[PDB]
Design a binder for this molecule. Structure first.
Ligand SMILES: Cc1cc2nc3c(=O)[nH]c(=O)nc-3n(C[C@H](O)[C@H](O)[C@H](O)COP(=O)(O)OP(=O)(O)OC[C@H]3O[C@@H](n4cnc5c(N)ncnc54)[C@H](O)[C@@H]3O)c2cc1C
Ligand SMILES: Cc1cc2nc3c(=O)[nH]c(=O)nc-3n(C[C@H](O)[C@H](O)[C@H](O)COP(=O)(O)OP(=O)(O)OC[C@H]3O[C@@H](n4cnc5c(N)ncnc54)[C@H](O)[C@@H]3O)c2cc1C
Ligand SMILES: Cc1c(-c2ccc(Cc3ccc(OC(F)(F)F)cc3)cc2)[nH]c2cccc(F)c2c1=O
Ligand SMILES: Cc1c(-c2ccc(Cc3ccc(OC(F)(F)F)cc3)cc2)[nH]c2cccc(F)c2c1=O
Ligand SMILES: Cc1c(-c2ccc(Cc3ccc(OC(F)(F)F)cc3)cc2)[nH]c2cccc(F)c2c1=O
Ligand SMILES: Cc1c(-c2ccc(Cc3ccc(OC(F)(F)F)cc3)cc2)[nH]c2cccc(F)c2c1=O
Ligand SMILES: COCCOCCOCCOc1ccc(C(C)(C)CC(C)(C)C)cc1
Ligand SMILES: COCCOCCOCCOc1ccc(C(C)(C)CC(C)(C)C)cc1
Ligand SMILES: COCCOCCOCCOc1ccc(C(C)(C)CC(C)(C)C)cc1
Ligand SMILES: COCCOCCOCCOc1ccc(C(C)(C)CC(C)(C)C)cc1
Ligand SMILES: COCCOCCOCCOc1ccc(C(C)(C)CC(C)(C)C)cc1
Ligand SMILES: COCCOCCOCCOc1ccc(C(C)(C)CC(C)(C)C)cc1
Ligand SMILES: [Mg+2]
Ligand SMILES: [Mg+2]
Ligand SMILES: [Mg+2]
Ligand SMILES: [Mg+2]
Ligand SMILES: [Mg+2]
Ligand SMILES: [Mg+2]
Ligand SMILES: [Mg+2]
Ligand SMILES: [Mg+2]
Lengths: 495, 495
């Protein structure tokens, strides 16, 4: 008669929650239509065949039996509805049979889905890069085109059109997918398809001026330079406005009147999140959240507007709306001991108060750039209000989904139904840095305190980092073997 | 201006011909809708996940550039018609575009296709085991059923029906597929799906009394016994007469009035060859062969009824009809040493005459069991006629397709258009033995001079043999890694 936790989703949030939740203390069931976890950062490597599926996945059932002897459960179902008042969910199986399941706690970790921005033709003609199947269909399509263009029944003009790969999105995924194809094209493809090599082209399309815009400006410049040197067409300051079967249209970001029509053989849509239908439907059943576009949780990751406080959400499907500083001005004033309401006084209690208000974190509020002398209570109120307003929810990353999962599973293991049940601290994420592979052995990294901008050892750095991020020795084994395989025998052409 | 050889098929015949044909001497194009070679003997290992696709395939384009600097070509096309008088073929691409190609020599190696014996429902409901895609669909279906039966919305009786795997055919493929699933079920499946393990069953269905009927009787008995000990249902002396969506019917071979209806979740059809449509159509355009069921070639592998003798066929798509001894009686009599026509006299010239008549081979004619005293010329004629009649074409195996490919490519390299062009010997195959994996570490082997019947080292023997039969170091690399992988981390569930 253990308390029942249902986890929705087998992704970065759901799977890492499963990995850490105590199966002895709780009865845990994970529910997802996907019976494996996907190591998403390595998906671009799958498009070119640099790494294989064994590196990029984990089967959920392999992690249901922990060392202590207590077990979790897994069900291959898609959740369609949540009924928070009666504490059950409705699911369907692959045959649309309905399943009803009761819970004591619900962890919503259903992620997000691809977003076409309703641009005509994108869903019909473009390839997304969101999961294992996506990457493999992309790889297979490219391989198919190479074989098709080796046939005698096609002209050089038609080849140039068919062998043009266009990647839409200048963020890390678009960049890495482009880099991986450029390497593949320049190495194995050049060797095995020498007669059509010269007709192959790649373009990357990005609305802003910078590839990798969330990295540093020096990294962006170096990335565009590396792409130029690789003869990739860098179409920064352009965005897609229409997609047809054999061509698409782009629009200048600098001149609204300038458009271009481009022929293509493979169109890859590397960008865009939208909310799952489950989340859209769930929102409308919570009065307080009825017209939200995204699920809001509080600073403890509890879904807002649930009287029972027994539904949580983590990862890409949620945004945090923390307890407001300015609704607790007087309490905070008393807490301040340096009696003189200054920003420095507040910062002096920031260790204690961040346990309640994550927006006070030095990672969330720049105290040095927002210093304030002595304030009246009303002015202090207004200041707290600015800190509230400034709070940024965790970015939609694997990094944050993983940290939230560990935080929350630890809360269930060591705080809930124990004498620390009222000492639960708020969630505050830690940025660990970002990495990107940008072609021809060059890796860039934007880390706390370091930037990496290519060089002979940058690819070594990437391997050292990722082998430690993999979640099993099996995957690490494959990670190592795949690089040996690729070095000695090259990328595979089997499709 | 080099002479053009077109090879049809990328299989055991076609690919091994490609591996050995001199690209300097000829202009070689291989044509096949499959741009990889399939190492068919390891396909059962793929069904259970014991080995991966990288062990079982070779990409054709990897072998087009030989060390000399001379190259072959490959085109992804399906051949639809041969026009032997005008020395060209018609092909289609994957989009049904027609391609016309001329040749100086044509090597037909298109193999065979699956045969349902027109039994109602097998093409609709059964899974075949002939190529990479077949094996993977079988694996995926089995994995899908396991997940479906873990759902709460299904009774135990429905589970027993759904988790029944039936394999039709008691030859090596059927036996090996059954053994691989039995191992998978008893190991990884038992561990990951403990709650439904007890509902899983496997049956193998075979018309004759023996599993592995082409092996020795001791091997057949040991195999049936090993299957019993693994609680596999061995349905020898039964054959399938009808297949429906959820059940099939079998018929006793020993009592025509006894039938049984059996429920099943996965039905695997491991047996049956039929001729390709291409061969069926080609036959009707050759007057002398117009009503044949299979393509006949002479002792030098030349298709019969082609005035230009420039079409050859090898592998499963052909049968050899050698030059008849009895149509050359007087010539043979003169060749014989002494004046007395005895079977021993014939056997004394058997080395020389076997270069012309493969049916005189000691591997084809038992001289000791057909000893003959002094014969009159007419009696000798009748004796020769018996040898002609006794000749058996090479069995449809990878071993024979490979040997035919090496024989014929060597004929092109070293006999055709050289001063040995009239010293071309007939094709005579060499039996090297057979191997089968029969479950729970047990390997059997029927070899010249040895039989292997399981034991601790039989699996080691299997590995030693197969790693030497693989056609590249890449595949051998994967062969070794896969066994390490499977030992340390188990077979994968990713699908
Ligand atoms: C190509 C690519 C590269 C990336 N690289 C990085 C990187 O380098 N660094 C980084 O920090 N982040 C990276 N990310 C981001 C990271 O993948 C996401 O932020 C992360 O997936 C979020 O985790 P999640 O658990 O919220 O969603 P997901 O990991 O997507 O998991 C969602 C799960 O919910 C399941 N699900 C969906 N609907 C339902 C339903 N109705 N009922 C039950 N289950 C359902 C899905 O099958 C899936 O298992 C990358 C993403 C992509 C696509
Ligand atoms: C599961 C399994 C296990 C086996 N195990 C063994 C074993 O242990 N030992 C053994 O000796 N034999 C074994 N065999 C038999 C062996 O696979 C066959 O005898 C062998 O494949 C015959 O070689 P082939 O070249 O004639 O045909 P295949 O190897 O089948 O090749 C035929 C090729 O022709 C291509 N093709 C088909 N139609 C056309 C067309 N119209 N135009 C152009 N190309 C075309 C096909 O795509 C294929 O590439 C096994 C077979 C199977 C199915
Ligand atoms: C091995 C291999 C494959 C692969 C595996 C299995 C198949 C199965 C398959 C399915 C259908 C087929 O019918 C048809 F002929 F139609 F394609 C053929 C094969 C195809 C490709 N992908 C990879 C993808 C990324 C990186 C990799 F390292 C690999 C890799 O190393
Ligand atoms: C090594 C290396 C490679 C790689 C693979 C193929 C090539 C092929 C290639 C590219 C450019 C070429 O023109 C030339 F070399 F002339 F510049 C020629 C071949 C180059 C690099 N990918 C990686 C991808 C991700 C993470 C990594 F750690 C690596 C990595 O460590
Ligand atoms: C790794 C791996 C796989 C495998 C590879 C790629 C996929 C790709 C895939 C395609 C579609 C998907 O969407 C869906 F989930 F819907 F199926 C998911 C994955 C699936 C399985 N087969 C194997 C088969 C035999 C032996 C093996 F060792 C493997 C193996 O080691
Ligand atoms: C080793 C080995 C195996 C193998 C794989 C899994 C098991 C799992 C297993 C099966 C039955 C079990 O209950 C019992 F032990 F009772 F039999 C327990 C585990 C057993 C053998 N297949 C092979 C397949 C082909 C070629 C080979 F060379 C091997 C081989 O060398
Ligand atoms: C785990 O979340 C998945 C997100 O993957 C993003 C890749 O970014 C990696 C940067 O984060 C780090 C930081 C430090 C490290 C350690 C300390 C483990 C490795 C080291 C020594 C290379 C810095 C690893 C990864
Ligand atoms: C069962 O748990 C597996 C998941 O482990 C999660 C934490 O892993 C962090 C450490 O991971 C590694 C990975 C590789 C290595 C090796 C041995 C390859 C050495 C290295 C990374 C220093 C080069 C060391 C530690
Ligand atoms: O027993 C389970 C076996 O797994 C435990 C250790 O697994 C590994 C896997 C890979 C590795 C590295 C990364 C060093 C690669 C290796 C052993 C293939 C060289 C080390 C240990
Ligand atoms: C030639 O490839 C055709 C496919 O054959 C697959 C079945 O193999 C059956 C075994 O026949 C052989 C072939 C070679 C060998 C060698 C000589 C390579 C192995 C050895 C040294 C262990 C006896 C043994 C048995
Ligand atoms: C480029 O060559 C690839 C094709 O090779 C065909 C001929 O191969 C026959 C010998 O093959 C092997 C395979 C493995 C080995 C090793 C080194 C693994 C030793 C072994 C088989 C004795 C265990 C030796 C010879
Ligand atoms: O060809 C290009 C160079 O790569 C060929 C490497 O050849 C081998 C030799 C041995 C092996 C085995 C399987 C014996 C070696 C092992 C143990 C490293 C996997 C694999 C590949
Ligand atoms: Mg998740
Ligand atoms: Mg995931
Ligand atoms: Mg998501
Ligand atoms: Mg989520
Ligand atoms: Mg062939
Ligand atoms: Mg083959
Ligand atoms: Mg065949
Ligand atoms: Mg053939």
């Amino acid at each position: 008669r253990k308390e029942k936790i249902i986890i929705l989703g087998s992704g970065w949030g759901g799977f890492n929650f499963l990995l850490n939740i105590d199966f002895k203390k709780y009865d845990v069931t994970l529910i997802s239509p996907r019976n494996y976890f996907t190591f998403t950062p390595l998906l671009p490597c799958l498009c070119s065949g640099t790494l294989s599926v064994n590196v990029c996945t984990e089967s959920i059932r392999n992690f249901l039996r922990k060392k202590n002897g207590y077990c979790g459960n897994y069900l291959q179902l898609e959740c369609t509805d949540v009924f928070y008042e009666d504490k059950y969910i409705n699911c369907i199986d692959i045959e649309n049979n309905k399943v009803k399941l009761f819970y004591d706690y619900l962890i919503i970790a259903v992620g997000a889905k691809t977003n076409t921005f309703n641009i005509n033709g994108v869903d019909k003609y473009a390839y997304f890069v969101k999961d294992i199947d996506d990457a493999l269909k992309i790889r297979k399509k490219f391989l198919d085109i190479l074989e098709k263009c080796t046939l005698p029944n096609i002209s050089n003009e038609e080849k140039k059109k068919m062998l043009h790969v266009a990647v839409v999105g200048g963020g890390p995924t678009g960049v890495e997918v482009t880099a991986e194809f450029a390497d593949f094209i320049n190495k194995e493809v050049k060797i095995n398809y020498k007669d059509i090599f010269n007709f192959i082209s790649i373009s990357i399309i990005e609305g802003g001026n910078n590839l990798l815009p969330t990295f540093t400006q020096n990294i962006s410049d170096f990335t565009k330079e590396n792409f130029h040197n690789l003869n990739i067409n860098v179409l920064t300051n352009y965005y897609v406005i229409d997609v047809d079967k054999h061509s698409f249209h782009i629009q200048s970001s600098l001149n609204k009147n300038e458009k271009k029509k481009l022929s293509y053989g493979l169109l890859i849509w590397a960008s865009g999140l939208a909310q799952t239908t489950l989340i859209q439907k769930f929102l409308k059943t919570i009065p307080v959240q009825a017209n939200n576009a995204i699920l809001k949780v509080d600073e403890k990751l509890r879904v807002i507007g649930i009287p029972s406080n027994n539904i949580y959400a983590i990862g890409d499907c949620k945004k945090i709306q923390p307890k407001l500083l300015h609704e607790h001005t007087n309490e905070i004033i008393k807490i301040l001991t340096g009696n003189k309401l200054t920003s420095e006084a507040l910062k002096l209690k920031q260790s204690e108060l961040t346990k309640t208000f994550p927006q006070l974190s030095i990672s969330k509020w720049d105290y040095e750039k927002n210093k304030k002398g002595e304030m009246t209570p009303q002015q202090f109120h207004d200041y707290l209000f600015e800190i509230d307003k400034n709070y940024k929810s965790p970015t939609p990353t694997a990094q944050n989904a993983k940290q939230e999962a560990y935080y929350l599973s630890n809360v269930f293991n060591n705080f809930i139904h124990t004498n620390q049940k009222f000492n639960i601290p708020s969630f505050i994420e830690k940025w660990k840095g970002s990495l990107a592979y940008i072609g021809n052995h060059q890796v860039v990294a934007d880390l706390p305190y370091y930037e990496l901008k290519g060089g002979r050892f940058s690819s070594t750095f990437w391997k050292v980092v990722y082998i430690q991020l993999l979640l099993s020795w099996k995957s690490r084994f494959h990670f190592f073997i795949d690089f040996i395989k690729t070095k000695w025998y090259g990328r595979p052409f089997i499709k």
